[PDB]
């Protein structure tokens, strides 16, 4: 179908940066303090952007 055609066409574009994204996500889950990760989850449950909060 057309969804499959779009999938197989956009695979190679979409997959170039996926490695660094997963690397950064896992390194964050590992190296960052779990209290900080819990605070991020808390703010995300509160509908806020925790990155903007941290910068502020």
């Amino acid at each position: 179908s057309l969804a499959k055609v779009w999938m197989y066409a956009s695979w190679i574009p979409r997959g170039i940066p996926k490695a660094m994204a997963n690397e950064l996500s896992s390194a964050a889950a590992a190296l960052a303090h779990p209290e900080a990760i819990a605070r991020v989850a808390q703010l995300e449950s509160q509908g806020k952007n925790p990155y903007r909060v941290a910068r502020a």
Binding site: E35, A38, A41
Partner: protein, 106 residues
């Protein structure tokens, strides 16, 4: 600060810090600074640290909790009462002292 709670497996409350097997926790228990290493959490259940800012879910069981002492510099920690926690001292059964056989003399 806060409380440690056991609740059934599934969706984690946002804000709760999971305590998986292998998690080390520096605390103070009855005036004694201690490290608790989590080992063999039961199935269908998980344990999490809930700060006071985090609301507890339903069907949660507070295993042990801390008091409110924000002005305190040196926190008091917890007080595990008899029945709150089953602490096992190793028996260490001292076996029989190795005695050399006395030879008989008629």
């Amino acid at each position: 600060t806060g409380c440690v709670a056991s609740f059934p497996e599934g969706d984690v409350p946002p804000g709760a810090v999971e305590c998986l097997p292998g998690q080390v926790i520096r605390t103070k228990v009855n005036g004694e600074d201690v490290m608790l290493e989590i080992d063999e959490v039961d199935p269908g259940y998980q344990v999490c640290w809930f700060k006071p800012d985090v609301p507890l879910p339903e069907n949660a069981e507070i295993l042990w909790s801390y008091p409110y002492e924000p002005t305190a510099a040196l926190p008091t920690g917890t007080t595990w009462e008899e029945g709150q926690a089953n602490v096992l001292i190793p028996a260490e059964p001292t076996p029989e002292a190795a005695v050399w056989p006395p030879t008989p003399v008629t």
